[PDB]
Amino acid sequence: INPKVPIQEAYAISNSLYDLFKLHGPLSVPNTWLRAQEAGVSGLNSKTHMKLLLKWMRGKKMLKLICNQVGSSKKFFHTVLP
C-alpha cells in the first residue's frame, strides 16, 4: 500500500503499536486509541492519524485486518499478524 506517514519515526511508532497489539489482543478495533492512550505514546496526534498509521503498518505487513462478523453486524479486527 502507499499512504502518508513520517519517514523514520514511523518505524519506532510502528514497533510501539505492534508491542501494544501483541500484548493486548486482536480485539483492537478502532478506538484502539484508548489502548494506545493508556499504554500511551505521543507519536500520534488524532484518531485519523491513528488509522493512517494502522493502514501503513498493515501495508508493511505488521498488522492484518480480519473479519469476525456476528449476526448482521460488521466487526473487524486488527490482528497483530501471526
Partner RNA sequence: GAUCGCCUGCCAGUGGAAGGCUUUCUGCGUUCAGUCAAUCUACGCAGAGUGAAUCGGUCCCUAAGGAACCCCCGAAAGGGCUGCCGUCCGAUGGGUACACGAAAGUGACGAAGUUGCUUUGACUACAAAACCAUGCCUCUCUCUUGGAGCGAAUUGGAUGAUCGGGCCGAGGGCAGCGUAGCGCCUCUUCCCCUCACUCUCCUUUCUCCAAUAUGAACCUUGAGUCAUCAAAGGCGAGUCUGUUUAUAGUCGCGACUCUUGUCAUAGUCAAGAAGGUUGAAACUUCCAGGAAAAAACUUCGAAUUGGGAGGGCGAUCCUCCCGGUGAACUGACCGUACCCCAAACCGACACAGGUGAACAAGUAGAGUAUACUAGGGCGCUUGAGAGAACCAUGUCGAAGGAACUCGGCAAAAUGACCCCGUAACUUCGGGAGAAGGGGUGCUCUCCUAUCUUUUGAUUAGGAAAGCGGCACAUACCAGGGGGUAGC
Q: List contacts with RNA (CB under 7 A).
A: 1-2, 5, 7-8, 64-65, 67, 69, 74, 76
Per-residue CA distances from 22 to 3, 12, 15, 41, 79 (Å):
23, 16, 10, 16, 8
Shortest Cβ 38–RNA spacing (Å): 27
Cβ proximity to RNA: between 39 and 66 the closer is 66
Residues 21 and 63: beta-carbon distance below 8 Å: yes
d(CA 57, CA 17): 9
Nearest distance, CB of residue 3 and RNA, angstroms:
7
Nearest CB to RNA, comparing residues 38 and 70:
70
